[PDB]
Design a protein around this ligand. Structure first.
Ligand SMILES: CC[N+](CC)(CC)Cc1ccccc1
Ligand SMILES: [Mg+2]
Ligand SMILES: [Mg+2]
Ligand SMILES: [Mg+2]
Length: 340
């Protein structure tokens, strides 16, 4: 049962949850990886890792992925959550120098992961290990696009460091543009392709129906996170959240901003439903009778199916994960799974 202020009946009725068959082994394998890469203290991994549900989130998203692909995606995604925690803690503790150094190492490790596999900063070494494995599935042209996208993500995190140290809440339009980068919209979209086993040519993945379906899936996910993580983010002096931008710059009340965010999330769903039809029609056109065409057709169909699965996986993740349960913390500004 989902709280009424967070409930989306269309998701519950029309987007049935999916779970990848590898998820049991995925759960333990990623937890051991967090342990062995020293990405979180051992006692916090034991106490909190399974309850954070990071592997469940990815296992309900990239259906059909080969087990080894899903493992690399799950390790990268767990790393990404820890990086968000590190970013937050560097901000809270005014560690501008340590962040600047981290920011630079992640740029370098993204271009040359093998050089960073044993870096003294375990967060860098953990990133390099996951990126190394992601680079082993598709041609170097896909690797280059992943890197180009993630370079921008790192720099969007640096913009968040600038905003939060300076006490700046971005405007609504400014926030929406930045959120497509801090959420890594295009990274999750890139990773559809190794999950279906096919790098898509530019003419396919830029087709208007594919691009708009991919966008809507990510806008829903990011804004639903905003809706669900608003309580912890207000408690933690986070400034990056559509709700916070609305309260600050449009002088909405909390209740008004929650409603506005809800409506925007709801429209992503029904816009997606319409564009989903066009994207599946495109998949049908790709099946032109050739072997390449059937290949491309099946890949697009699988990818669009997983764009749909992102809606349900993100929805349920926010009600299962301990990441957001701010009411259970002794210090509402300091989550217990963060190294402070
Ligand atoms: C801050 C963590 N995360 C994912 C690693 C960064 C993009 C956002 C997120 C939250 C909830 C579901 C999916 C992604
Ligand atoms: Mg965060
Ligand atoms: Mg963040
Ligand atoms: Mg959030």
């Amino acid at each position: 049962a989902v709280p009424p202020s967070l409930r989306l009946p269309v998701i519950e009725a029309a987007f049935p949850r999916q779970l990848h068959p590898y998820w049991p082994k995925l759960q333990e394998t990623t937890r051991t990886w967090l342990l062995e890469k020293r990405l979180m203290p051992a006692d916090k991994v034991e106490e909190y890792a399974d309850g954070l549900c990071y592997t469940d989130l990815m296992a309900g998203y990239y259906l059909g992925a080969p087990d080894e692909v899903l493992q690399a995606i799950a390790d990268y995604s767990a790393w990404y959550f820890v990086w968000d925690d590190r970013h937050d803690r560097d901000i809270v503790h005014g560690r501008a120098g340590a962040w600047r150094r981290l920011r630079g190492l992640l740029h370098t490790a993204l271009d040359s992961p093998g050089d960073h596999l044993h870096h003294e900063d375990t967060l860098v070494a953990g990133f390099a290990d996951s990126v190394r494995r992601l680079y082993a599935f598709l041609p170097a042209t896909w690797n280059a696009r992943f890197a180009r996208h993630f370079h921008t993500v790192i720099e969007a995190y640096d913009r968040e460091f600038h905003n939060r140290t300076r006490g700046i809440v971005p405007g609504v339009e400014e926030y929406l543009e930045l959120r497509r980068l801090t959420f890594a919209h295009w990274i999750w979209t890139d990773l559809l392709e190794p999950s279906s086993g096919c790098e898509l040519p530019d003419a396919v993945r830029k087709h208007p129906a594919y691009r708009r379906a991919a966008l809507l899936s990510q806008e829903f996910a990011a804004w639903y996170n905003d809706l669900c993580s608003l309580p912890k983010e207000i408690a933690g002096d986070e400034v990056h959240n559509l709700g916070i931008s609305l309260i600050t710059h449009h002088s909405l009340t909390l209740e008004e901003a929650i409603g506005e965010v809800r409506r925007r999330v709801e429209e992503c769903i029904t816009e997606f439903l319409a564009v989903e039809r066009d994207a599946l029609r495109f998949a049908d056109e790709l099946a032109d009778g050739t072997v390449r065409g059937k290949e491309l057709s099946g890949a697009v169909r699988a990818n669009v199916g997983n764009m749909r699965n992102w809606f349900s996986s993100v929805y349920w993740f926010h009600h299962e994960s301990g990441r957001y349960m701010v009411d259970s913390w002794d210090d509402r500004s300091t989550p217990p799974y963060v190294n402070n």
